[PDB]
Nucleic acid binder design. Structure first.
Ligand SMILES: [Mg+2]
Ligand SMILES: [Mg+2]
Ligand SMILES: [Mg+2]
Ligand SMILES: [Mg+2]
Ligand SMILES: [Mg+2]
Ligand SMILES: [Mg+2]
Ligand SMILES: [Mg+2]
Ligand SMILES: [Mg+2]
Ligand SMILES: [Mg+2]
Ligand SMILES: [Mg+2]
Ligand SMILES: [Mg+2]
Ligand SMILES: [Mg+2]
Ligand SMILES: [Mg+2]
Ligand SMILES: [Mg+2]
Ligand SMILES: [Mg+2]
Ligand SMILES: [Mg+2]
Ligand SMILES: [Mg+2]
Ligand SMILES: [Zn+2]
Lengths: 114, 54, 120, 122, 216
RNA sequence: UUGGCACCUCGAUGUCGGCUCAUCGCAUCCUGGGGCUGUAGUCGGUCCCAAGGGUUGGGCUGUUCGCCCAUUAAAGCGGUACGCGAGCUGGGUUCAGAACGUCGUGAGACAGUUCGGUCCCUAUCCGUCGUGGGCGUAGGAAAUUUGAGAGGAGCUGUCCUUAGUACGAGAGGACCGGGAUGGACAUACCUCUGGUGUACCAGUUGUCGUGCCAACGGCAUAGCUGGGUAGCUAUGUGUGGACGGGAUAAGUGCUGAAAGCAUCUAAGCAUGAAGCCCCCCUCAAGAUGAGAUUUCCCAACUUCGGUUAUAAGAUCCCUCAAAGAUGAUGAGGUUAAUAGGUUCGAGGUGGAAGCAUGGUGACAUGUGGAGCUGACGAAUACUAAUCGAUCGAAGACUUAAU
């Protein structure tokens, strides 16, 4: 394991609510932002590039194209701000870090579903 | 990179204190008592180390 | 880990040669560092001979050499055959420590520490 | 991590299409800039018949970068480009449209006409 | 104004009140025992020895700091406690609220209690002037032959010497460091642990002196 | 600075500028404190104290100087062989080649210009940065330590509020006081984002090999490519320069004479700067003035004087790192989890080999989040840290109090 004490301290910060997803698949992320007035909830619908880390330091970055501009939104997996994670597809992928998509945009960025 | 002054016998000898070598990590072999050997090493004579020939 | 006055590939080949030579000879006279590094190699190979699967032969052929040894029945045999057929059958209760070392003493030419390493 | 001699695309309609930075504003010895920060600039490429033409010196806001920004929740946001929007006094543009997405830190930066005109804040 | 010894274990994350991320450092402080209570009468300065990490007892033929030596075993018997591995004093702490043999706990501190941790930094070896003092590297092209060396050293005939505070290559290693104004986040008592916000000095398996801040 | 004199150097004192590294002065550029004002207020002028910190990036030029662009609190003046070439460069001047203008009958010449043009050295001494051994500190040892001293850090903007107040016709617009947030810098560290990551994982080309298919191996920059554990790191994460005290500087005052008054001074008293001594951080008892505390060890022979090995303690020697050029420091040394291996995991890669199945085939699917996995976590004596050896006290005299 990581460490018998690290794990036992940082257990409480974990979250078991969440699903099992992999880099490749298009998911949504219902972020719980705090705009300067109040709390809204905007969604970031994109494909997962990667997941790294172990434990509370697990992460996953998501990539969306808004208007020809590529966006890359990284998160900690165990935030309280992520109220919900929905999952649309399960994309087919032979790697774990889809960094080849950063150079590709359009018909070549297509992930094939299973 | 070139000395201006010769190095006296006094300085030569004051420097050649720590250049010596020490008594090795020597011990007896208990198979033969005498024929001192190196510690944690095989005995050349007895071929031994903890009783067993090698 | 450790580097032995050799670059990466030379180190790999030296280690494979030492492993294989050990498997053939059952004891070899070397320097202590090369011993201390090849014991890991050897012991992992013995573990593969104990697991005994085809995939384990295939993974140990990645690390052994194709050598031919004559048996005492005047018979032809390979390192890998010897390994998976004899050596892993000797150690079926022994859980590691398939190899020992004996510090011999300082070599004349280079002042190196010679050792003897065998698979008891 | 935006410096001198960085060329930034321009995310408005003011006439400028590529823009080169000169000095980052905020203090002395300031090496770099990042999202939300203001820069002096010059226009190396301009759209024909644009309001803001070639070789005009002008201020601008950094709107999006590859060397993105960290948030207090650990969330990061990066982009596939570097972009500017050109301004004057009152922290608002001399254009009227903004292209592509924009970051939230401009809210704290009081660039509110920009945030309102941006088609997607992120 | 208190004090406690520990071991740097490492670093993790933890989430605050508002989803705020927090980089945090784990410090295990078990087997903390007051041993000697110094006094202005006898030592001239009021202070408190504190032990850490109970270790093994006398052995006739011992060969390490594992097995405690007979002076130390006596020093601790005088407190009616076990021999100890790490000892340090704490002058800022008060005298009356500690007696000898008393066991300190992590529970002394509290969430939000501000501190300063002092520990022996990580060991970089013999290093050069750049790595060690943050100097600049000479140019790597244009016919240069000065890349990573320390530059000039002194001036000339006037000042035909090299001032003492000159900066040259040497041992970059384990220098004692105090980090100030760090915040205590959380405390765990089954595990006897202290979570500290930040980047405390020294390596893993390494002693750490946590104590209350002198400046506020 | 321009020069003068020609005292050192011609059996060699390397010569402009830039770079790296800083150091000092103050005739102070900013910030600090004050007086006068033709000081309404914001801003300013001028002078006084003040050297703690800071005092920018580019264009042109070999260029220093200088002009310009853009900022900044400010973009300081000078010295240090116009600081620093056994620390770099060598653009420029200053060798030999060549050419223009001009001079010269000519060879050739020009503080005229132009193209090109070899920058040697393994550091003896001092010095400096780090690191150890010897002895000493009146017994021998282990740990914790005060601090004579030394060193470091010492910066500053923008905003909000007081308050759109005081001021002023208005335009405009404070001090004081409180709070917040950044630039540069220093430091520690790697959970985060990124980098590397040559005994990690996978893909792939050519060629040769393991007898052939399959699978593997070697060479091709690690063959190339895509990710990447540990550690090392910044571009990343945290913190810092906080709040104050005492005595002073220019000054500002009270009392108060000498001099019936006046009068900050002569006696006396109070106040007063980012400055000084402290507070803060680190090293520190070789501080030969060698400190203190706590604990441990405490015989036998004697020429009588003194010895002796031995105790405590530490080393040799070995296994290793959190340490490291080597010594050393630290974890451990069989009454043993120090490293290796082994079994589990984390993290990483991303779906092994074989078999079967659908396809003419390239391939695809299932068995199966498969198999591999160097450094990280845990458990486990399987292997090696064997037996041993060496060093290491018996505490001088005097005086006084007991
Ligand atoms: Mg190769
Ligand atoms: Mg070079
Ligand atoms: Mg001479
Ligand atoms: Mg000479
Ligand atoms: Mg002055
Ligand atoms: Mg000069
Ligand atoms: Mg030179
Ligand atoms: Mg020069
Ligand atoms: Mg010359
Ligand atoms: Mg003529
Ligand atoms: Mg001339
Ligand atoms: Mg040429
Ligand atoms: Mg990192
Ligand atoms: Mg890590
Ligand atoms: Mg091949
Ligand atoms: Mg084949
Ligand atoms: Mg060949
Ligand atoms: Zn023997």
């Amino acid at each position: 394991t990581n460490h018998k004490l690290i794990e036992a301290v940082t257990k409480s910060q974990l979250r078991t609510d969440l699903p099992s997803f992999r880099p490749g698949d298009t998911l949504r992320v219902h972020v719980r932002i705090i705009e300067g007035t109040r709390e809204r909830i905007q969604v970031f619908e994109g494909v997962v590039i990667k997941r790294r880390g172990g434990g509370v330091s697990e992460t996953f970055t998501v990539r969306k194209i808004s208007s020809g501009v590529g966006v890359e939104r990284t998160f900690p997996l165990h935030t309280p701000k992520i109220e919900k994670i929905e999952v649309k597809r399960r994309g087919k992928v032979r790697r774990a870090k889809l960094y080849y998509l950063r150079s590709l945009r359009g018909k070549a960025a297509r992930i094939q579903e299973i | 990179a070139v000395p201006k002054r010769r190095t006296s016998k006094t300085r030569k000898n004051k420097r050649r204190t720590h250049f010596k070598i020490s008594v090795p990590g020597m011990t007896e072999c208990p198979n033969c008592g005498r024929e001192y050997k190196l510690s944690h090493r095989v005995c050349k004579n007895c071929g031994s180390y903890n009783g067993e020939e090698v | 880990y450790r580097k032995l006055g050799r670059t990466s590939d030379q180190r790999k080949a030296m280690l494979r040669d030492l492993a294989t030579s050990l498997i053939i000879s059952e004891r070899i006279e070397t320097t202590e560092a090369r011993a201390k590094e090849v014991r890991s190699v050897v012991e992992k190979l013995i573990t593969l001979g104990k697991k005994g699967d085809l995939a384990s032969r295939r993974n140990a052929a990645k690390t052994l050499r194709n050598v031919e040894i004559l048996n005492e029945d005047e018979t032809t045999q390979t390192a890998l055959q010897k390994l998976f057929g004899e050596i892993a059958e000797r150690y079926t209760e022994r859980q590691g420590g398939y190899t020992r070392i004996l510090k011999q003493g300082p070599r004349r030419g280079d002042g190196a520490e010679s050792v003897i390493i065998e698979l008891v | 991590m935006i410096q001198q001699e960085t060329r930034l695309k321009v995310a408005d309609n003011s006439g400028a299409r590529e823009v080169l930075t000169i000095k980052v504003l905020g203090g002395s010895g300031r090496k770099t800039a990042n999202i939300g920060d203001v820069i002096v600039c010059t226009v190396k490429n301009a759209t024909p018949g644009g309001v803001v033409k070639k070789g005009d010196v002008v201020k601008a806001v950094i709107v999006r970068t590859k060397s993105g920004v960290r948030r207090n929740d650990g969330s990061y946001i990066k982009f596939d480009e570097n972009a500017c929007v050109i301004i004057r006094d009152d922290k608002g543009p001399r254009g009227t449209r903004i292209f592509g997405p924009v970051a939230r830190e401009l809210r704290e930066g009081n660039f509110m006409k920009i945030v309102s005109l941006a088609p997607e804040v992120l | 104004t208190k004090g406690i010894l520990g071991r740097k274990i490492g670093m993790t994350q933890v989430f605050g009140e508002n989803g705020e991320l927090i980089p945090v450092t784990v410090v295990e402080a078990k087997e903390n025992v007051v041993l000697q209570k110094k006094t202005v009468e006898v030592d001239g300065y009021n202070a408190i020895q504190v032990g850490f990490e109970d270790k093994k007892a006398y052995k006739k033929d011992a060969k390490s700091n594992k097995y405690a030596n007979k002076p130390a075993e006596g020093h601790a018997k005088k407190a009616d406690a076990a021999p100890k591995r790490f000892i340090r004093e704490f002058r800022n702490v008060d005298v009356d609220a500690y007696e000898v043999g008393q066991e300190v706990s992590v529970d002394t501190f509290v969430a939000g209690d501000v501190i300063d941790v002092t520990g022996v930094s990580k060991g970089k070896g013999f290093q050069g002037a750049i790595k060690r003092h943050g100097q600049s590297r000479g140019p790597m092209s244009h016919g240069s032959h000065f890349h990573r060396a320390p530059g000039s050293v002194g001036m000339a005939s006037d000042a035909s010497r090299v001032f003492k505070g000159q900066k040259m290559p040497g041992r970059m290693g384990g220098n004692t460091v105090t980090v100030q104004n760090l915040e205590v986040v959380q405390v765990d008592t089954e595990n006897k642990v202290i979570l500290v916000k930040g980047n405390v000095p020294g390596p893993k398996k390494g002693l750490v002196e946590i104590r209350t801040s002198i400046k506020k």
